[PDB]
Amino acid sequence: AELTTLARPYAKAAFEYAQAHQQLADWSAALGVLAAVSQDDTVRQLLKEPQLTSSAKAQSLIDVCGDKLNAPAQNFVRTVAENKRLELLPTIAEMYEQLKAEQEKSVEVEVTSAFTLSKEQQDKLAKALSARLSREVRLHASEDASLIGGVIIRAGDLVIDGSVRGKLAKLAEALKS
Amino acid sequence: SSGRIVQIIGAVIDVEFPRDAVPSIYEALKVQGVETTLEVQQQLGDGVVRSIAMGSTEGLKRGLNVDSTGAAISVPVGKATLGRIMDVLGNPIDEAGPIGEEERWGIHREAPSYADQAGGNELLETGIKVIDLVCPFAKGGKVGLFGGAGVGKTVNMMELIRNIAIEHSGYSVFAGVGERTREGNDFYHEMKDSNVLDKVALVYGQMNEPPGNRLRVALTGLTMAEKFRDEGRDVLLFIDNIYRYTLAGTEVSALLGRMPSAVGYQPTLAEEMGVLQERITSTKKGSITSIQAVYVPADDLTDPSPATTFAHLDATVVLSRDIASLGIYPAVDPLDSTSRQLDPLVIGQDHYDTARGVQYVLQRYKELKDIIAILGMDELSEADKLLVARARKIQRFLSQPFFVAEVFTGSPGKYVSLKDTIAGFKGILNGDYDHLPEQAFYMVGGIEEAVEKAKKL
Amino acid sequence: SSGRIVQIIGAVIDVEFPRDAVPSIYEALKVQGVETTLEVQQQLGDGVVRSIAMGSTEGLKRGLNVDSTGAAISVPVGKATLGRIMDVLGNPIDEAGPIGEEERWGIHREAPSYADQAGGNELLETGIKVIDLVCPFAKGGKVGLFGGAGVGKTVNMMELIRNIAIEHSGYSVFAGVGERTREGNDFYHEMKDSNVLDKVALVYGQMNEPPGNRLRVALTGLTMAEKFRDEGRDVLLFIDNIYRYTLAGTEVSALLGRMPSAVGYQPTLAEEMGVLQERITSTKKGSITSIQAVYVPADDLTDPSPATTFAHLDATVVLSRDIASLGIYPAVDPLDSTSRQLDPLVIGQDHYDTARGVQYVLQRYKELKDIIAILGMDELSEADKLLVARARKIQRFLSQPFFVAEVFTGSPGKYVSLKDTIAGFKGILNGDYDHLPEQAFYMVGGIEEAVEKAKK
Amino acid sequence: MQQLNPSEISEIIKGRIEKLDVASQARNEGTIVSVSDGIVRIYGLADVMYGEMIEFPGGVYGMALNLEQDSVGAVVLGEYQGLAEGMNAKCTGRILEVPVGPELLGRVVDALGNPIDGKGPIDAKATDAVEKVAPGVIWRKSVDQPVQTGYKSVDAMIPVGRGQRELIIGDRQIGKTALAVDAIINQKDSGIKCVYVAIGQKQSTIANVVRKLEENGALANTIVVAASASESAALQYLAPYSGCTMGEYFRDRGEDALIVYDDLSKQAVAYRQISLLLRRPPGREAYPGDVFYLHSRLLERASRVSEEYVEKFTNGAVTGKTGSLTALPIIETQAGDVSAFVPTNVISITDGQIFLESAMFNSGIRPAVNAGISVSRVGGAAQTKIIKKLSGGIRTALAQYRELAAFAQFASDLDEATRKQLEHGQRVTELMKQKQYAPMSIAEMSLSLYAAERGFLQDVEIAKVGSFEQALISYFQREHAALLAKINEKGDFNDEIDAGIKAGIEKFKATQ
Ligand SMILES: Nc1ncnc2c1ncn2[C@@H]1O[C@H](COP(=O)(O)OP(=O)(O)OP(=O)(O)O)[C@@H](O)[C@H]1O
Ligand SMILES: Nc1ncnc2c1ncn2[C@@H]1O[C@H](COP(=O)(O)OP(=O)(O)O)[C@@H](O)[C@H]1O
Ligand SMILES: Nc1ncnc2c1ncn2[C@@H]1O[C@H](COP(=O)(O)OP(=O)(O)O)[C@@H](O)[C@H]1O
Ligand SMILES: [Mg+2]
Ligand SMILES: [Mg+2]
Numbered sequence A: 001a002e003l004t005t006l007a008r009p010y011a012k013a014a015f016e017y018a019q020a021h022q023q024l025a026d027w028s029a030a031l032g033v034l035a036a037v038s039q040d041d042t043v044r045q046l047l048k049e050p051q052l053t054s055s056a057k058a059q060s061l062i063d064v065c066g067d068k069l070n071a072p073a074q075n076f077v078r079t080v081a082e083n084k085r086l087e088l089l090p091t092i093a094e095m096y097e098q099l100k101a102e103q104e105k106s107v108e109v110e111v112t113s114a115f116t117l118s119k120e121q122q123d124k125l126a127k128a129l130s131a132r133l134s135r136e137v138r139l140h141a142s143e144d145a146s147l148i149g150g151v152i153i154r155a156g157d158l159v160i161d162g163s164v165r166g167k168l169a170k171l172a173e174a175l176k177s
Numbered sequence B: 001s002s003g004r005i006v007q008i009i010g011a012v013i014d015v016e017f018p019r020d021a022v023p024s025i026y027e028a029l030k031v032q033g034v035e036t037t038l039e040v041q042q043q044l045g046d047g048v049v050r051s052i053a054m055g056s057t058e059g060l061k062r063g064l065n066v067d068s069t070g071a072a073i074s075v076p077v078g079k080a081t082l083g084r085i086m087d088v089l090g091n092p093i094d095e096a097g098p099i100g101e102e103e104r105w106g107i108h109r110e111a112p113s114y115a116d117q118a119g120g121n122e123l124l125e126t127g128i129k130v131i132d133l134v135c136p137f138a139k140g141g142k143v144g145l146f147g148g149a150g151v152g153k154t155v156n157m158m159e160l161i162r163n164i165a166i167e168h169s170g171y172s173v174f175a176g177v178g179e180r181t182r183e184g185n186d187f188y189h190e191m192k193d194s195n196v197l198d199k200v201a202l203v204y205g206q207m208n209e210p211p212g213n214r215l216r217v218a219l220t221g222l223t224m225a226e227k228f229r230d231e232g233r234d235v236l237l238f239i240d241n242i243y244r245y246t247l248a249g250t251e252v253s254a255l256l257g258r259m260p261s262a263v264g265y266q267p268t269l270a271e272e273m274g275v276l277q278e279r280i281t282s283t284k285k286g287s288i289t290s291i292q293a294v295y296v297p298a299d300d301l302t303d304p305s306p307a308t309t310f311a312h313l314d315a316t317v318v319l320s321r322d323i324a325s326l327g328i329y330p331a332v333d334p335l336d337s338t339s340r341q342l343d344p345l346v347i348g349q350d351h352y353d354t355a356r357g358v359q360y361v362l363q364r365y366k367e368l369k370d371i372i373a374i375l376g377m378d379e380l381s382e383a384d385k386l387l388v389a390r391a392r393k394i395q396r397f398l399s400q401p402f403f404v405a406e407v408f409t410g411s412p413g414k415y416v417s418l419k420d421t422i423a424g425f426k427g428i429l430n431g432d433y434d435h436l437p438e439q440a441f442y443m444v445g446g447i448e449e450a451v452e453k454a455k456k457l
Numbered sequence C: 001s002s003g004r005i006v007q008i009i010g011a012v013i014d015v016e017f018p019r020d021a022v023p024s025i026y027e028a029l030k031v032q033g034v035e036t037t038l039e040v041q042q043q044l045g046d047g048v049v050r051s052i053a054m055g056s057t058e059g060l061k062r063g064l065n066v067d068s069t070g071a072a073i074s075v076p077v078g079k080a081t082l083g084r085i086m087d088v089l090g091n092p093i094d095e096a097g098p099i100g101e102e103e104r105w106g107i108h109r110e111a112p113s114y115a116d117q118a119g120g121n122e123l124l125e126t127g128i129k130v131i132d133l134v135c136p137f138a139k140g141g142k143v144g145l146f147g148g149a150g151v152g153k154t155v156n157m158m159e160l161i162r163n164i165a166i167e168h169s170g171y172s173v174f175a176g177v178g179e180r181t182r183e184g185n186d187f188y189h190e191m192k193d194s195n196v197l198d199k200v201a202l203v204y205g206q207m208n209e210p211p212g213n214r215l216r217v218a219l220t221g222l223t224m225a226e227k228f229r230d231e232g233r234d235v236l237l238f239i240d241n242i243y244r245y246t247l248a249g250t251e252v253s254a255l256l257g258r259m260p261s262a263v264g265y266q267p268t269l270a271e272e273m274g275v276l277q278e279r280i281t282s283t284k285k286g287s288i289t290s291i292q293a294v295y296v297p298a299d300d301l302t303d304p305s306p307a308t309t310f311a312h313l314d315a316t317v318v319l320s321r322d323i324a325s326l327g328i329y330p331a332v333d334p335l336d337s338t339s340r341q342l343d344p345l346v347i348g349q350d351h352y353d354t355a356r357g358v359q360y361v362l363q364r365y366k367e368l369k370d371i372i373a374i375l376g377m378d379e380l381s382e383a384d385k386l387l388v389a390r391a392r393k394i395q396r397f398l399s400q401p402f403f404v405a406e407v408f409t410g411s412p413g414k415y416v417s418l419k420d421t422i423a424g425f426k427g428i429l430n431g432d433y434d435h436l437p438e439q440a441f442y443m444v445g446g447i448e449e450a451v452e453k454a455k456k
Numbered sequence D: 001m002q003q004l005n006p007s008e009i010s011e012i013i014k015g016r017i018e019k020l021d022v023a024s025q026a027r028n029e030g031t032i033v034s035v036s037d038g039i040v041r042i043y044g045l046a047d048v049m050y051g052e053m054i055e056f057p058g059g060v061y062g063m064a065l066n067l068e069q070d071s072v073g074a075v076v077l078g079e080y081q082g083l084a085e086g087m088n089a090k091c092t093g094r095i096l097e098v099p100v101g102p103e104l105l106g107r108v109v110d111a112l113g114n115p116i117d118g119k120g121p122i123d124a125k126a127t128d129a130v131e132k133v134a135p136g137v138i139w140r141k142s143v144d145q146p147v148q149t150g151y152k153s154v155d156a157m158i159p160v161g162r163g164q165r166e167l168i169i170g171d172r173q174i175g176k177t178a179l180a181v182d183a184i185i186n187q188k189d190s191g192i193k194c195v196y197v198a199i200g201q202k203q204s205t206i207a208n209v210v211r212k213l214e215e216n217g218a219l220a221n222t223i224v225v226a227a228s229a230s231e232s233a234a235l236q237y238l239a240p241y242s243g244c245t246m247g248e249y250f251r252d253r254g255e256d257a258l259i260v261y262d263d264l265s266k267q268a269v270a271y272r273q274i275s276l277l278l279r280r281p282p283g284r285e286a287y288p289g290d291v292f293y294l295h296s297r298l299l300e301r302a303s304r305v306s307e308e309y310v311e312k313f314t315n316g317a318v319t320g321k322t323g324s325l326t327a328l329p330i331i332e333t334q335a336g337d338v339s340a341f342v343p344t345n346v347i348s349i350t351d352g353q354i355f356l357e358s359a360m361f362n363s364g365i366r367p368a369v370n371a372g373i374s375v376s377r378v379g380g381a382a383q384t385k386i387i388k389k390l391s392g393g394i395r396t397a398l399a400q401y402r403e404l405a406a407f408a409q410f411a412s413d414l415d416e417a418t419r420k421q422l423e424h425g426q427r428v429t430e431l432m433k434q435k436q437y438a439p440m441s442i443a444e445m446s447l448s449l450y451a452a453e454r455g456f457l458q459d460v461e462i463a464k465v466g467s468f469e470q471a472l473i474s475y476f477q478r479e480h481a482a483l484l485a486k487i488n489e490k491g492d493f494n495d496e497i498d499a500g501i502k503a504g505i506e507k508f509k510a511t512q
């Protein structure tokens, strides 16, 4: 199975607890610290040792994380480790962030461009995307010398190609055929 | 330290232990408060062992505490086992009280070494005519009685127990592996009435028992026979169905996490067969004469389980469905059954030429049967007519009334000596009885009884 | 409340619902845009049901909203279904307006109880000689017509519809399950032209349909027959290929997450057959006489779908490709066709003795095939030669020209009474027609037509 | 990186966020996670045993068969379609039990013992366990008392005794149910009670069998247990054990019972469905590996027990009496393929079998018994003395006659011993034919075996043997009534009975 298929009910249980008890930012910081701690190489070598029990792996992760975990997050760590699902801990955190983006009505949008865009240009693209998607948007701008002009908007699976490289590929397909 | 049951799927039970106290492979385990024993098969990792129950799983729950004994399944050995009926664990299943043994042995053991082997060639007379003719047995040898369902393996085994084990001066072990409880009770009262039971130890695991009992009961009987062999004695050992040891190993196999081999069997079929069969043999300390009947599934000798049993035996007796369906018993196929003692340096020249002459005449008639079935008897030549008549008389004279089968025939049983058998089959082969009808040789015994029966037709 | 589509693999759709609003097993669901009906099979947990679409799934996407109807698939029942063609959902497909029904019934219900069963052995004469001889039928009984591809099953059913319609005055339900659309159009225009359409209700889910329609159309036709039975009437139920219900349960079985049984079938084969077949019976309220065609895959009778079908029937008619390759129609193997009405306390001693003598002569003729093929008839004995001669005259006299087979040959069809069949086969078995040639016994109605055909 | 287990669902995980302790739910309670095809997977139920009943809402009961690490797989003893996810499941603390007693005689019940005939409640004073362990080897006594089926070929060639298991195997529609129902009907004056178990049949066939029992006066001696074709596969799997428990009530109190399992093949199909839907790994023809154990735990419960076991069971109330249970399983084969898995297992379990063949069924030999392939493992021990003395060697001589009759088909001339053998085999073959629903007593069968085996049939030609048999029995029922009654007391044979039957057949052939 995929990692998202296995990571779906843990993120849904954590999101339903954090929406029921008004602790959304606490669990988002806790799952971010837990994902980043579980991707470090020394902790990953410790979590693959065969002589350790699952309770000692959960106790080592709780003792490493410390003050960034409240008591239901520690209960969540013991439930994840008892079902042998600790390698899912980045994917769980990512799916939690997706659920929180549907709850606060926001979408994370990546915009790539040929030259640097100013704040007026980002506010203009963000307002057009907020009118189209009916969500508060958050733009993340980046550069690319492969484009000769224009922008490329990526929002989830939605791709809007306004670059002239794509218009050059359309003209090449229109004159080749 | 103790473990706890985490999973019960059928006969297979998974137990979790602490990581410093994992039991070994083939360690016996005791469930607390319920009278059931578990045998460790696999170590799965993370403290978990996978085991098979030696009793019914109806009273078991998850969460039950399981203790380790620190050793394998140990059964009583010595002469305290004589005259008693035991199960796979060595508990008495008669009502004669406790076994007062002085020594217990584990049921799992190495085979004897190559330097420990010792093979004799002493002839063992049986009193059955086809067995004395075409498949002569050896003292301290191994005998198979192959055959399908209903062809006579148990009746042949009871006739060999009557004609060998009653006059035997030593000890015997009978191992009932996955068979009928009625036959087990019938045999116990037969050895009790004949005053023979004091030399014979009985070990029983029936077909209604859990698969763990049927998987180890032959090892229990062989362990008591190994103690009697390593005491320096000459031991008999009878196993009525060695196939049931294999089939129970089928029943647990894919629940143990094994992918299946061909014809649905376990992939460890030949190795589990060889581990049991290589301990039965006679050594330089003592001798074991073993008689095992082997079940053949759907009369197919090319099925993989009898075809792996064929290489382990010295004398192979194959029972045919076709010959028993013609009303002929003991129903030994005389062309499909061979023996290592069918040698001119062992039985003499005369016995060997009589047996090969009988086999040549029957193999010729096997090729002439459909020709007489299509065109008729008159369309052959003269030597074909004489050979077909001598062959039908050979096929009726191979039959014999038995003492243990008088409840089935109505006629009393016969004991026929080897020299009577060789002289009678030589007299049929030489044409000294070409004038008698073929019905005179059916169910008679010696050749003189065929002559007495021919005057009553 | 509403759910969302999370998975689409072929005909099988997984829909996620909220946890206090999970729909039950066999509940109908509706997609909000396209109006595709789904029927719930399994509850997987996590709010997700696994369902089978009653239609095409091309064009459907994940994320579509799905409503629940609160009940099962309900079809119109009663007087208004007669004369009309409907599909699996009860919608009319004959371009004749809406059905003016007064009630609708769900298509899933339990079998009637053991105390509600009705016994009866009253004979139903079919007019066909081999059927009236060796496997006779009863009113309120169950008939299977087993056979391989192109051996006749549909021609025999059309002849059985035509001859059973003579002495029957109640209603009929005809269910086409996975067969040819052209056969449905021919049967509808034939009944409309001869004015018997207003007694017969037609349900069709044919070979062109997605497998949910083929999986559930026989339940709809049986629900209409159950309403006619529970009004206290005597009704006829005809099902062309019941094998095609079973094969639709093959096509969705691995998509429902099941491990396969032997030769790739579904593991729930006998239970789906039993849950369908135990509703077909007569009760104490009214009676159902049922005729079902049963397909045999690759001409193998030990295939598990006909071999499970055999014990659900009162009368079994087995057809043969070898007998039809000899030119003999209706191609019935008389040694493989049985019925429970072939019993001397039902039909009398004379008819039973004639049928047992015919089966004895054909069995001893079947045992001589290889020796006749190798050495010929000349090296038999004289009583064997006489029995082979009477056996070939019996085999020729078992054939019959049909009224529905008049397009294939041009020879007119024949109706033969039971008395003429018993008298003719008794006269062949006694030796009264040993002077007749055997080709005079071929394709005639009575034994008197063989007497007139011998003088030609 | 395996797939999602059935306890990996977000109310359960959110539960563990709210409280990590396992005591949030009690150890005798659980909740339904999943419902599919009669299989209910349950989170919880931590104190459940294998085979324990589980209480669902609405009166629905189930049984736990898979006890995994995180989940319990249960099969529904009834309809499953009303069950839903999120319902509460309870441990009853009990294994499945059925009513037992003589009050069930004359009644048609289901696999749980509830009546389905509409004749009111069953007032049974006792319940007993459905799954039970067969009695051990020290508590049995050898089979030595007869069970009479009323048929000449069965009671003369393949005899059945009290405590024996005799299979009826063969192809479809050739008379397996006819032999078993006629063997039930012949016990109406014998003292042996009867149990008929129908597995996988249609209900009209079951009601036809019960009306054929009622027309022959045998319904009041017979419990009928029905698990029909539209019922759940769990009830179809548990019906032979429940009928076996109802038969074993009479065995445990020093009385004698007889049971028919009319399809054990359909019970193997139902257990194959339950094993595949629980995702247990399959083997040959997708059957589970434990399927031989499924039959061998059943058929070993049919046994004859000693007097000491009966005195131990009844606490001294019944002394000096043995008890028995005689089984007749029935196996359907597919076009004579005995190499399939379930027929290989059931031939290997029983104390013999009766093979029925389609070719002799079509050739007019209506009980259709193949004497060369059929056999009895108890033999002459299961017979009375007159039947044992008159039937000695008939079966093997008939098998030799089937060999000789195919050997000499085109022979020009044969010797006198060969001509005598063929003529005797043709008369015994014609003597073994018998109609349905006509039982024969001990005296009529011994008149027929005296006439065939003492050579009173050698002047009778073949189409007259059946008429000779019926006319000779009608002559001894007019003229020798005390002789037939004296044979029918116990089945005795001495010189005086021998001379009386010899003078009676000689006077019958003289005057009639
Ligand atoms: N001795 C007999 N004489 C005449 N007819 C018989 C005899 N025994 C059985 N029959 C007939 O044979 C037919 C088939 O028998 P039966 O229904 O018992 O078969 P079965 O093998 O049990 O069938 P099924 O497939 O339904 O289980 C019946 O119609 C019955 O009347
Ligand atoms: N030697 C024999 N003489 C007569 N009948 C026999 C003989 N051997 C076997 N039979 C018959 O065949 C039956 C089956 O024999 P059995 O030894 O039980 O077979 P197996 O052990 O091979 O299954 C016996 O119970 C009996 O009826
Ligand atoms: N009674 C009959 N007379 C003549 N031909 C027939 C008869 N029955 C069948 N056939 C021939 O066999 C063909 C197939 O018949 P059909 O009933 O369609 O078979 P099935 O239903 O088994 O597929 C017919 O179209 C015709 O050619
Ligand atoms: Mg045996
Ligand atoms: Mg057709």
Ligand SMILES: [Mg+2]
Pocket (backbone or CB within 6 Å): D176, D177, D262
């Ligand atoms: Mg039957």
